[PDB]
Amino acid sequence: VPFVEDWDLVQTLGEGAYGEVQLAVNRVTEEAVAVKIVDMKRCPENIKKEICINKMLNHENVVKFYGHRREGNIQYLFLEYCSGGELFDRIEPDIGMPEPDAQRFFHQLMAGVVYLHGIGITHRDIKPENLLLDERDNLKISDFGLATVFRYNNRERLLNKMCGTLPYVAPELLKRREFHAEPVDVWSCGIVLTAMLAGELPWDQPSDSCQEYSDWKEKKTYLNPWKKIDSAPLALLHKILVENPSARITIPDIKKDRWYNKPLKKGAK
Ligand SMILES: O=C(Nc1ccccc1N1CCNCC1)c1csc(-n2ncc3ccccc32)n1
């Protein structure tokens, strides 16, 4: 058993356009889970898609989906709780974080992205606010509200929907009518890596009109944020933040990168 199906809402984890995320604790087991609550009266289609995609997810670096409950016009998505909070909060403004910590988070982010791409899913909005940490500081990708299928029955479909978050979005999304999904998620991962190592975002958007983006294209790496980044991870960023998505490094090649494979001091937590 009796009561095992009861959950107590104990605290608000966050509030935003998606609704709110609360921490819930099981009345009997004390198991902690996150609950995304949405007033479907203010979706029903978006919600269904998010649930359908969540149902496909089973990986250690992706927030797990436990199920959902519909109480009238309120939808309840039960998700894996990540007590370590958002990666965003581990990034010190203007500083970033220690390189070994950034590398470990990057390895884990890559593992989650490889998994998603392997099942034909693109996240479309990778950024530190959406990357969560568990009790051992293991990274988990969250928020599949913009996620979509880019490969089905072994055939790729090109994307055309402009979406994401400007400082993280790849340049082809702003310039081209259609584009491949994978390089767009690679690019945002490179912006996340830059933020972790420098504590700042390099540009407002990767447009010709953006001076900071122009400076990067001109290899002015003596300027911030680049100047703050050691040569080895900077060499990886030179391969990721490549304007032409067809020339941009792919994940299998990121896995062969020198910095990616450099032993640094960091363990779980
Ligand atoms: O799936 C989750 N969230 C989630 C699911 C769907 C849309 C948005 C979110 N959030 C919004 C706030 N930033 C993170 C993504 C989720 C699973 S655990 C969790 N947790 N855990 C700790 C925590 C602290 C702040 C915000 C969310 C948090 N959130």
GROMACS .gro file of C-alpha atoms and ligand atoms in nm:
model
  298
    1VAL     CA    1   0.244  -0.278  -0.091
    2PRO     CA    2   0.000   0.000   0.000
    3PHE     CA    3   0.100   0.364  -0.067
    4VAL     CA    4   0.394   0.291  -0.298
    5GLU     CA    5   0.226   0.492  -0.574
    6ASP     CA    6   0.219   0.816  -0.370
    7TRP     CA    7   0.466   1.099  -0.426
    8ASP     CA    8   0.512   1.414  -0.220
    9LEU     CA    9   0.618   1.733  -0.400
   10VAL     CA   10   0.891   1.879  -0.179
   11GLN     CA   11   1.048   2.167  -0.367
   12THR     CA   12   1.055   2.365  -0.689
   13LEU     CA   13   1.367   2.291  -0.890
   14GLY     CA   14   1.293   2.540  -1.169
   15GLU     CA   15   1.024   2.739  -1.354
   16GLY     CA   16   1.013   2.856  -1.718
   17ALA     CA   17   0.843   2.833  -2.058
   18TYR     CA   18   0.819   2.453  -2.023
   19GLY     CA   19   0.624   2.488  -1.696
   20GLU     CA   20   0.797   2.389  -1.374
   21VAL     CA   21   1.017   2.106  -1.252
   22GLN     CA   22   0.967   1.988  -0.896
   23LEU     CA   23   1.146   1.740  -0.673
   24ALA     CA   24   0.911   1.460  -0.562
   25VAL     CA   25   0.983   1.196  -0.299
   26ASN     CA   26   0.805   0.861  -0.276
   27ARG     CA   27   0.594   0.829   0.038
   28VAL     CA   28   0.716   0.471   0.104
   29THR     CA   29   1.060   0.429  -0.055
   30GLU     CA   30   1.188   0.785  -0.027
   31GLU     CA   31   1.310   0.752  -0.387
   32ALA     CA   32   1.360   1.098  -0.534
   33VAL     CA   33   1.245   1.188  -0.884
   34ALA     CA   34   1.193   1.506  -1.082
   35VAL     CA   35   0.848   1.593  -1.209
   36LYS     CA   36   0.785   1.825  -1.500
   37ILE     CA   37   0.442   1.976  -1.454
   38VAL     CA   38   0.263   2.132  -1.748
   39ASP     CA   39  -0.079   2.296  -1.768
   40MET     CA   40  -0.179   2.151  -2.107
   41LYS     CA   41  -0.455   2.414  -2.122
   42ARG     CA   42  -0.202   2.693  -2.178
   43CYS     CA   43   0.053   2.191  -2.614
   44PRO     CA   44  -0.102   1.843  -2.621
   45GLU     CA   45   0.091   1.768  -2.941
   46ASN     CA   46   0.424   1.896  -2.809
   47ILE     CA   47   0.369   1.699  -2.489
   48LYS     CA   48   0.291   1.380  -2.677
   49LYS     CA   49   0.607   1.412  -2.888
   50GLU     CA   50   0.823   1.480  -2.583
   51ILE     CA   51   0.684   1.170  -2.414
   52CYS     CA   52   0.727   0.957  -2.724
   53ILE     CA   53   1.089   1.059  -2.764
   54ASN     CA   54   1.155   1.018  -2.390
   55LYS     CA   55   1.020   0.664  -2.412
   56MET     CA   56   1.302   0.576  -2.650
   57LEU     CA   57   1.575   0.693  -2.415
   58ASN     CA   58   1.792   0.452  -2.218
   59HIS     CA   59   2.147   0.575  -2.157
   60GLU     CA   60   2.356   0.668  -1.853
   61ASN     CA   61   2.417   1.023  -1.986
   62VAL     CA   62   2.053   1.097  -2.073
   63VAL     CA   63   1.787   1.185  -1.811
   64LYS     CA   64   1.568   0.871  -1.780
   65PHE     CA   65   1.192   0.886  -1.830
   66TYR     CA   66   0.982   0.692  -1.575
   67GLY     CA   67   0.633   0.761  -1.710
   68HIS     CA   68   0.361   1.021  -1.698
   69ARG     CA   69   0.035   1.100  -1.520
   70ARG     CA   70  -0.253   1.311  -1.652
   71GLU     CA   71  -0.470   1.474  -1.386
   72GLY     CA   72  -0.733   1.672  -1.576
   73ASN     CA   73  -0.547   1.942  -1.768
   74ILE     CA   74  -0.220   1.891  -1.580
   75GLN     CA   75   0.049   1.665  -1.724
   76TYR     CA   76   0.312   1.506  -1.501
   77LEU     CA   77   0.635   1.376  -1.653
   78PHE     CA   78   0.838   1.166  -1.410
   79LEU     CA   79   1.208   1.202  -1.475
   80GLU     CA   80   1.543   1.103  -1.330
   81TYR     CA   81   1.641   1.343  -1.053
   82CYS     CA   82   1.989   1.497  -1.077
   83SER     CA   83   2.090   1.628  -0.736
   84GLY     CA   84   2.400   1.796  -0.870
   85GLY     CA   85   2.184   2.050  -1.058
   86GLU     CA   86   2.266   2.229  -1.384
   87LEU     CA   87   2.607   2.233  -1.543
   88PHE     CA   88   2.544   2.605  -1.593
   89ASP     CA   89   2.600   2.660  -1.219
   90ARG     CA   90   2.947   2.495  -1.231
   91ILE     CA   91   3.073   2.754  -1.480
   92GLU     CA   92   3.233   3.047  -1.300
   93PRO     CA   93   3.178   3.371  -1.490
   94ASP     CA   94   3.494   3.476  -1.673
   95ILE     CA   95   3.682   3.173  -1.538
   96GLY     CA   96   3.505   2.852  -1.642
   97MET     CA   97   3.622   2.551  -1.438
   98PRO     CA   98   3.934   2.336  -1.406
   99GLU     CA   99   4.033   2.177  -1.734
  100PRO     CA  100   4.015   1.815  -1.599
  101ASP     CA  101   3.655   1.876  -1.488
  102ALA     CA  102   3.563   2.026  -1.825
  103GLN     CA  103   3.720   1.734  -2.006
  104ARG     CA  104   3.528   1.476  -1.799
  105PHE     CA  105   3.198   1.660  -1.857
  106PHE     CA  106   3.284   1.680  -2.230
  107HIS     CA  107   3.354   1.308  -2.250
  108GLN     CA  108   3.015   1.240  -2.090
  109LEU     CA  109   2.833   1.490  -2.309
  110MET     CA  110   2.987   1.316  -2.616
  111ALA     CA  111   2.874   0.977  -2.488
  112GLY     CA  112   2.516   1.101  -2.452
  113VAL     CA  113   2.518   1.270  -2.793
  114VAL     CA  114   2.663   0.961  -2.965
  115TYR     CA  115   2.384   0.760  -2.805
  116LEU     CA  116   2.111   0.999  -2.924
  117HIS     CA  117   2.252   1.023  -3.275
  118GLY     CA  118   2.281   0.641  -3.286
  119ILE     CA  119   1.904   0.609  -3.231
  120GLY     CA  120   1.834   0.883  -3.486
  121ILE     CA  121   1.744   1.157  -3.239
  122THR     CA  122   1.882   1.513  -3.242
  123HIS     CA  123   1.844   1.725  -2.925
  124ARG     CA  124   1.856   2.066  -3.095
  125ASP     CA  125   1.915   2.277  -2.786
  126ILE     CA  126   2.228   2.159  -2.612
  127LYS     CA  127   2.352   2.416  -2.357
  128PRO     CA  128   2.468   2.411  -1.991
  129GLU     CA  129   2.120   2.483  -1.853
  130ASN     CA  130   2.003   2.152  -2.006
  131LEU     CA  131   2.298   1.937  -1.895
  132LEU     CA  132   2.239   1.805  -1.544
  133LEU     CA  133   2.458   1.639  -1.288
  134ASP     CA  134   2.373   1.345  -1.060
  135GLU     CA  135   2.506   1.281  -0.709
  136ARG     CA  136   2.844   1.173  -0.850
  137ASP     CA  137   2.861   1.461  -1.097
  138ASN     CA  138   2.779   1.237  -1.394
  139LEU     CA  139   2.631   1.450  -1.675
  140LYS     CA  140   2.283   1.381  -1.813
  141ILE     CA  141   2.123   1.547  -2.113
  142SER     CA  142   1.771   1.682  -2.043
  143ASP     CA  143   1.479   1.863  -2.204
  144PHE     CA  144   1.368   1.685  -2.518
  145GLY     CA  145   1.104   1.948  -2.597
  146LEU     CA  146   1.281   2.051  -2.920
  147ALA     CA  147   1.418   1.704  -3.004
  148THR     CA  148   1.326   1.531  -3.326
  149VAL     CA  149   1.394   1.231  -3.549
  150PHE     CA  150   1.662   1.284  -3.811
  151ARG     CA  151   1.716   0.915  -3.910
  152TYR     CA  152   1.450   0.648  -3.952
  153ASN     CA  153   1.477   0.312  -4.128
  154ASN     CA  154   1.839   0.406  -4.200
  155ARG     CA  155   1.747   0.711  -4.412
  156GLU     CA  156   1.842   1.058  -4.298
  157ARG     CA  157   1.598   1.345  -4.311
  158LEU     CA  158   1.731   1.701  -4.337
  159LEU     CA  159   1.611   1.962  -4.092
  160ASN     CA  160   1.466   2.302  -4.177
  161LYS     CA  161   1.313   2.425  -3.850
  162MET     CA  162   1.505   2.715  -3.702
  163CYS     CA  163   1.528   2.648  -3.330
  164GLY     CA  164   1.776   2.637  -3.043
  165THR     CA  165   1.945   2.919  -2.852
  166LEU     CA  166   2.139   3.179  -3.054
  167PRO     CA  167   2.480   3.174  -2.885
  168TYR     CA  168   2.478   2.792  -2.921
  169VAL     CA  169   2.328   2.761  -3.265
  170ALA     CA  170   2.535   2.657  -3.567
  171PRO     CA  171   2.577   2.911  -3.852
  172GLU     CA  172   2.416   2.694  -4.119
  173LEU     CA  173   2.089   2.707  -3.930
  174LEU     CA  174   2.082   3.083  -3.984
  175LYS     CA  175   2.195   3.076  -4.348
  176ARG     CA  176   2.056   2.763  -4.513
  177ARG     CA  177   1.704   2.641  -4.584
  178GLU     CA  178   1.795   2.279  -4.493
  179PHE     CA  179   2.079   2.130  -4.296
  180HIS     CA  180   2.207   1.804  -4.147
  181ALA     CA  181   2.117   1.746  -3.783
  182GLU     CA  182   2.436   1.600  -3.646
  183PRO     CA  183   2.679   1.885  -3.713
  184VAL     CA  184   2.439   2.125  -3.544
  185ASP     CA  185   2.455   1.929  -3.215
  186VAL     CA  186   2.836   1.899  -3.255
  187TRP     CA  187   2.860   2.278  -3.281
  188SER     CA  188   2.656   2.345  -2.969
  189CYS     CA  189   2.877   2.097  -2.781
  190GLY     CA  190   3.177   2.306  -2.892
  191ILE     CA  191   3.012   2.623  -2.753
  192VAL     CA  192   2.947   2.436  -2.425
  193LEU     CA  193   3.315   2.336  -2.416
  194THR     CA  194   3.421   2.697  -2.477
  195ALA     CA  195   3.197   2.813  -2.191
  196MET     CA  196   3.340   2.550  -1.957
  197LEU     CA  197   3.697   2.651  -2.031
  198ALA     CA  198   3.654   3.031  -2.044
  199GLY     CA  199   3.344   3.116  -1.839
  200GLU     CA  200   3.195   3.316  -2.128
  201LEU     CA  201   3.021   3.261  -2.460
  202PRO     CA  202   3.222   3.364  -2.766
  203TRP     CA  203   2.943   3.545  -2.958
  204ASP     CA  204   2.582   3.645  -2.948
  205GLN     CA  205   2.527   3.446  -3.270
  206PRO     CA  206   2.752   3.311  -3.545
  207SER     CA  207   2.661   3.572  -3.804
  208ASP     CA  208   2.867   3.778  -4.046
  209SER     CA  209   2.734   4.081  -3.858
  210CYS     CA  210   2.887   3.959  -3.531
  211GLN     CA  211   3.235   4.107  -3.475
  212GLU     CA  212   3.332   3.832  -3.231
  213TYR     CA  213   3.239   3.563  -3.483
  214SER     CA  214   3.435   3.745  -3.753
  215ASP     CA  215   3.738   3.766  -3.522
  216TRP     CA  216   3.724   3.388  -3.473
  217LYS     CA  217   3.697   3.325  -3.846
  218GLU     CA  218   4.010   3.544  -3.878
  219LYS     CA  219   4.193   3.331  -3.619
  220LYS     CA  220   4.240   3.618  -3.373
  221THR     CA  221   4.300   3.367  -3.093
  222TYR     CA  222   4.502   3.617  -2.892
  223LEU     CA  223   4.163   3.765  -2.796
  224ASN     CA  224   3.925   3.630  -2.527
  225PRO     CA  225   3.777   3.386  -2.483
  226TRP     CA  226   4.036   3.193  -2.684
  227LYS     CA  227   4.337   3.340  -2.503
  228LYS     CA  228   4.212   3.170  -2.187
  229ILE     CA  229   4.209   2.825  -2.344
  230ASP     CA  230   4.512   2.600  -2.352
  231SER     CA  231   4.648   2.509  -2.695
  232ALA     CA  232   4.534   2.148  -2.685
  233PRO     CA  233   4.159   2.205  -2.621
  234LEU     CA  234   4.178   2.514  -2.844
  235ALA     CA  235   4.298   2.292  -3.129
  236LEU     CA  236   3.982   2.080  -3.080
  237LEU     CA  237   3.765   2.393  -3.080
  238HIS     CA  238   3.929   2.494  -3.412
  239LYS     CA  239   3.795   2.167  -3.558
  240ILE     CA  240   3.445   2.191  -3.404
  241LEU     CA  241   3.364   2.559  -3.463
  242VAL     CA  242   3.410   2.532  -3.842
  243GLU     CA  243   3.157   2.733  -4.042
  244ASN     CA  244   3.103   2.478  -4.321
  245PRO     CA  245   2.912   2.187  -4.155
  246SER     CA  246   3.040   1.944  -4.418
  247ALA     CA  247   3.401   2.022  -4.316
  248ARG     CA  248   3.325   2.029  -3.942
  249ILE     CA  249   3.471   1.752  -3.731
  250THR     CA  250   3.242   1.453  -3.667
  251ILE     CA  251   3.210   1.277  -3.332
  252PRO     CA  252   3.416   0.972  -3.437
  253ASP     CA  253   3.697   1.217  -3.513
  254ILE     CA  254   3.648   1.416  -3.191
  255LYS     CA  255   3.710   1.084  -3.014
  256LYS     CA  256   4.054   1.070  -3.182
  257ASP     CA  257   4.152   1.424  -3.087
  258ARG     CA  258   4.471   1.474  -2.887
  259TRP     CA  259   4.316   1.678  -2.606
  260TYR     CA  260   4.011   1.451  -2.592
  261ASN     CA  261   4.255   1.167  -2.519
  262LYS     CA  262   4.490   1.357  -2.283
  263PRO     CA  263   4.508   1.209  -1.935
  264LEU     CA  264   4.410   1.484  -1.676
  265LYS     CA  265   4.335   1.457  -1.298
  266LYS     CA  266   3.960   1.400  -1.227
  267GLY     CA  267   3.726   1.128  -1.092
  268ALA     CA  268   3.361   1.107  -0.980
  269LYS     CA  269   3.237   1.359  -0.722
  270LIG     O1  270   1.421   1.651  -1.709
  270LIG     C1  271   1.443   1.749  -1.639
  270LIG     N1  272   1.414   1.880  -1.665
  270LIG     C2  273   1.345   1.933  -1.775
  270LIG     C3  274   1.257   1.856  -1.852
  270LIG     C4  275   1.184   1.915  -1.956
  270LIG     C5  276   1.203   2.052  -1.979
  270LIG     C6  277   1.290   2.130  -1.903
  270LIG     C7  278   1.365   2.071  -1.796
  270LIG     N2  279   1.459   2.142  -1.720
  270LIG     C8  280   1.438   2.285  -1.703
  270LIG     C9  281   1.545   2.351  -1.616
  270LIG     N3  282   1.684   2.319  -1.663
  270LIG    C10  283   1.700   2.177  -1.683
  270LIG    C11  284   1.599   2.111  -1.773
  270LIG    C12  285   1.510   1.733  -1.507
  270LIG    C13  286   1.543   1.609  -1.458
  270LIG     S1  287   1.623   1.623  -1.308
  270LIG    C14  288   1.604   1.792  -1.315
  270LIG     N4  289   1.659   1.870  -1.219
  270LIG     N5  290   1.733   1.809  -1.118
  270LIG    C15  291   1.787   1.906  -1.050
  270LIG    C16  292   1.754   2.033  -1.104
  270LIG    C17  293   1.780   2.164  -1.073
  270LIG    C18  294   1.730   2.270  -1.151
  270LIG    C19  295   1.649   2.240  -1.263
  270LIG    C20  296   1.619   2.108  -1.297
  270LIG    C21  297   1.673   2.007  -1.214
  270LIG     N6  298   1.547   1.838  -1.425
   0.00000   0.00000   0.00000
